[PDB]
């Protein structure tokens, strides 16, 4: 009898960038969701396809925990049927998405006085991503007709841009840590059940 490691997901030290989000697989454990029922003032606890109250009574084949960091005004983009920079070029959710999304402010943790340049996002891309797709390419984007030849210049841009988090920023431009819990059901013994 093993409890699920939700603490190691919510209480981590370093969170991945949005364009290289981190995925963890949770299986063969008893899911105690009280750690989510207590919480603290939290920016978002929105669930899709299932009620938060019934979680302690459903068995899932496996659970996916996806962790990353964005800014405040983009938190609304982590939801099915959304469009924008993050939705189209960084992280996309399916239309028939079952799972929960939790998001909370992290200004005291991910902000630096001179600017934090460790968190980056993709700005230029020629097409959207299929759901649950990751792109870690770092090649020069050709905006014009003349090929770039791997060097920046006119009509040739490095794709990734830096957030530059500062403590003097507005609430919408402050860092937010986002965890997406995705639930799956297939022909499996459903080793993630809960206390029932």
């Amino acid at each position, epitope marked *: 009898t093993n*409890l699920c490691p939700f603490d190691e997901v919510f209480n981590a030290t370093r969170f991945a960038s949005v364009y290289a989000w981190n995925r963890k697989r949770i299986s063969n454990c008893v899911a105690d969701y009280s750690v989510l029922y207590n919480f603290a003032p939290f920016f978002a606890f929105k669930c899709y396809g299932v009620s938060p109250t019934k979680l302690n009574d459903l068995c899932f084949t496996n659970v996916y925990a996806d962790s990353f960091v964005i800014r405040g005004n983009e938190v609304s983009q982590i939801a099915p049927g959304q469009t924008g920079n993050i939705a189209d070029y960084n992280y996309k959710l399916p239309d028939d998405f079952t799972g929960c999304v939790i998001a909370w402010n992290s200004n005291k943790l991910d902000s630096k006085v001179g600017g934090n340049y460790n968190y980056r996002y993709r700005l230029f891309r020629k097409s959207n991503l299929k759901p649950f797709e990751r792109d870690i390419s770092t090649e020069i984007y050709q905006a014009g007709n003349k090929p770039c030849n791997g060097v920046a210049g006119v009509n040739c841009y490095f794709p990734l841009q830096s957030y530059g988090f500062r403590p003097t920023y507005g609430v919408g431009h402050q860092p937010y840590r986002v965890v997406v819990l995705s639930f799956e059901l297939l022909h499996a013994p459903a080793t993630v059940c809960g206390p029932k």
Partner: antibody
Amino acid sequence: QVQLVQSGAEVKKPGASVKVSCKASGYPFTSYGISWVRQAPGQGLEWMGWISTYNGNTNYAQKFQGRVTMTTDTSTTTGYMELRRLRSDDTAVYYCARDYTRGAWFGESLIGGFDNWGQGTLVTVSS
Amino acid sequence: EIVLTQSPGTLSLSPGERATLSCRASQTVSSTSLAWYQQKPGQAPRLLIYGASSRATGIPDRFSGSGSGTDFTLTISRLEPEDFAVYYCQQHDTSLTFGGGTKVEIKR
């Protein structure tokens, strides 16, 4: 309530090996790892190693690599530390603690420290 | 490795005063990877502060922690007979290293 009990004091000779047990009770054993600390008589603290109670992965300090082995047993909810090639420099008090600095499942850093230390085992070596 | 230096070595203060202990580091350490422990004579150490600002369970509110970068501070507002012990500063950004230790004693 969280309780951690260690074995009694031990007197050894140089070159021999010492095994110290740490029995934990009052919490889910497999959700937390175990860390070991050493304190010389009248000196400061010194980290030794960390062991995961889930898969058995371990990380040891650079000073003790090759001399210390940490094992675990989940049926009896117990951890074991064995130190070999003992020297007079190694006479000290040894503490087992429940860890919240590195996770047991994925092995990544956490926000916390060492909570719920044991009472301490004095290992003294001399001829 | 990261070397943590505590200051000062010992403190001589009377009950009721305010205590301030400093931990400096050779390199920068994330504020979410610093901790403070307390050890009374003849016993085992106990966790006092984690995350450089938070408080462990069952800890009175007179203990506070602050700082960032390479300077961290542990403050006690009102001292008591039970708050005269040895204090330690720990980090686990790169590997794990303990501080030298600072001691508080009665003045007379």
